[PDB]
DNA sequence: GGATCGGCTC
DNA sequence: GAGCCGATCC
């Protein structure tokens, strides 16, 4: 069509997007990625620790895709 | 570590 | 007013 689904969702990783209920920002959107093992993460540092924890450092904090318009 | 809500900057 | 990150509770 007019919009495709290019690269934006790395394989082996899960993405979740849910809008917050109500608050001082009622209407905002929250998104986060859950490691393959089911580990939830929302911080670049925590990610750098998780990756290093398994010994794998190939992945980078810049690999995470939080955008909604792809890249 | 996990889940939910609010504070700060532009 | 809008957008992004941090603080609080368990």
UniProtKB/Swiss-Prot annotation:
Compartments in which it is found: Nucleus
**Domain MBD per the UniProt entry, residue ranges:** 3-71
- Associated clinical condition: Tumor predisposition syndrome 2: An autosomal recessive condition characterized by predisposition to develop a variety of tumors or malignancies, including acute myeloid leukemia, myelodysplastic syndrome, colorectal adenomatous polyposis and carcinoma, and uveal melanoma.
Task: Give a short account of what the protein does.
Answer: Mismatch-specific DNA N-glycosylase involved in DNA repair. Has thymine glycosylase activity and is specific for G:T mismatches within methylated and unmethylated CpG sites. Can also remove uracil or 5-fluorouracil in G:U mismatches. Has no lyase activity. Was first identified as methyl-CpG-binding protein.
On assembly, the entry states: Interacts with MLH1.
The protein, known as: Methyl-CpG-binding domain protein 4
List the source organism. Homo sapiens
Q: Which residues of the full protein are shown?
A: 80 to 148 of 580
